[PDB]
């Protein structure tokens, strides 16, 4: 009855009736113990719901505070250790060990959905090693992207990216005084190297202008079969905008771009002319 008299804060009830029914509950810190009251003497009230509408795996989690503690609580009854986060779609990446994953995951299509609605969003059960594997797959990439940011010499870049946390991808908004501690910081130049990275971002925006900032192809040319986005940009760079404009161009006119060959330009022109001529038929 505690819940009825506002003593057991019950938010969502992400449960799958007919199988497992795990749900977390909060409470105003006043020696109440929410799960305890929900369970009772040796699961007294717990047994009631267990054989209530049918054999269900009902579970109660002691809600801690905010959504961060809801993640682990949604992995119960099991053993969570860590989890990743993001923005709108944070996607709670469950981080457990294979040995404990057997019970944590329980069933492929059961605890993966019951704990998915627990937080209301969705969870991505992973492994302790998996986390590290993906973790590194992130350090190299603010670097693993053909280094399209600042750029100067490479021998200094290796020694700079050794100490550099999270590469340089938009790192100017972070502390601009700890890289000056690095052995070698005279006039503001590294504080300037980061500025170069910012300029690289603007250069990337200029590349977007090269692919949009200067009028990229229409939906007819972009959705044409046999052509990619780079090929459509290379074809549209010669003044064409639509698929009909690409059909108006010839093999010799498209031969000015080295990315397209004579046979490929002929096939693209024939496909555009067929789409223009047979456009009456679906």
């Amino acid at each position: 009855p505690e819940i009825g008299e506002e003593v057991i804060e019950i938010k969502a009830a992400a449960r799958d009736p007919g199988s497992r029914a795990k749900i977390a509950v909060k409470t105003n810190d006043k020696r109440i113990d929410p799960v305890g009251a929900c369970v009772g003497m040796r699961g007294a009230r717990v047994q009631a719901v267990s054989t209530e509408l049918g054999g269900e795996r009902i579970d109660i989690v002691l809600w801690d505070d905010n959504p961060a503690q809801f993640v682990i609580n949604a992995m119960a009854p099991a053993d969570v250790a860590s989890i990743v986060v993001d923005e709108d779609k944070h996607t709670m990446d469950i981080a457990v060990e294979a040995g404990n994953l057997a019970q944590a995951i329980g069933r492929n299509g059961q605890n993966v959905r019951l704990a998915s609605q627990l937080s209301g969003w969705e969870l991505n059960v992973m492994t302790v090693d998996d986390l590290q594997a993906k973790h590194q797959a992130e350090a190299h990439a603010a670097i693993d992207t053909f280094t399209k940011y600042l750029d100067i010499d490479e021998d200094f870049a290796t020694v700079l990216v050794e100490e550099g946390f999270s590469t340089l991808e938009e790192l100017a908004y972070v502390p601009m005084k700890e890289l000056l501690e690095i052995e070698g910081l005279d006039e503001p130049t590294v504080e300037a190297l980061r500025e170069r990275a910012k300029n690289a971002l603007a250069t990337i925006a200029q590349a977007q202008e090269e692919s949009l900032g200067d009028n990229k192809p229409a939906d007819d040319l972009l959705n044409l079969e046999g052509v990619d986005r780079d090929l459509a940009f290379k074809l549209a760079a010669r003044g064409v905008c639509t698929l009909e404009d690409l059909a108006e161009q010839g093999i010799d006119d498209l031969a000015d771009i080295e990315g397209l060959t004579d046979e490929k330009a002929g096939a693209l022109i024939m496909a555009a002319r067929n789409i223009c001529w047979f456009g009456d038929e679906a």
């Binding site: 008299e5 506002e6 003593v7 105003n28 810190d29 006043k30």
Partner: protein, 225 residues
């Protein structure tokens, strides 16, 4: 948020006489002017700001605030403040054991609600006159006592008070239960039971109003957050 000049204008710096003070308030006192204690605004302001911040934080997590003043000078104002931010209040005499003995008072609330319903929603009229007068009187009594806290449900998560010495019963209840207390504490008052003390003139009306208004604004902010 609240400036010092404004507080001075209100009359916060004024505090009780020099025969009626409390030596635990000695830190918060600055000097004694015409045999009247002056509260040190330098030390008051930062803590008032703190208290405001805490209140805001409480609001952000959907905390329930209770506004207590039964001085009968600033009863109107405390009610107004409570309503502005749609929070709860006790502007008339605090019932002994309102919080500690909630479960009993909860029945009281329920009876009041039922009576209100009868009055308004039923539209049944046709009641024996004396009986009708008695029911009306009961309604008035219960409205006066428990009007603000009727929609409260359970126990507040924080307690703002206008006078510590005057509302010591409420303070003691909050301490027993562990509810955070945010008290305006004049020189005569005892601030030991208070968690977030506020040295200010509980008596003067304008000062009380100022205190209330800033508190209400920060509650509204936390709600918005």
């Amino acid at each position: 948020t609240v400036s010092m000049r404004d507080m001075l204008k209100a009359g916060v710096h004024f505090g009780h006489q020099t025969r009626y003070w409390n030596p635990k308030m000695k830190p918060f006192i600055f000097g004694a002017r015409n045999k009247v204690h002056i509260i040190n605004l330098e030390k008051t302001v930062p803590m008032f700001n703190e208290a405001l911040a805490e209140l805001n934080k409480i609001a952000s997590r959907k905390g329930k605030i209770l506004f207590v003043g039964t001085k009968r000078a600033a009863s109107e104002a405390v009610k107004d403040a409570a309503l502005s931010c749609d929070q709860f209040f006790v502007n008339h005499r605090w019932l002994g054991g309102m919080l500690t003995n909630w479960k009993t008072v909860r029945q009281s609330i329920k009876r009041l609600k039922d009576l209100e319903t009868q009055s308004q929603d039923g539209t049944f009229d046709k009641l024996t006159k004396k009986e009708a007068l008695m029911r009306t009187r009961e309604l008035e009594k219960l409205e006066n006592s428990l009007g603000g806290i009727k929609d409260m449900g359970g126990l507040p998560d924080a307690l703002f008070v206008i006078d510590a010495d005057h509302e010591h019963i409420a303070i003691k209840e909050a301490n027993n239960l562990g509810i955070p207390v945010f008290a305006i504490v004049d020189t005569n008052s005892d601030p030991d039971g208070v968690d977030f003390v506020i040295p200010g003139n509980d008596d003067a009306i304008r000062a009380v109003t100022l205190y209330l208004g800033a508190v209400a604004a920060t509650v509204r902010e936390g709600r918005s957050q």
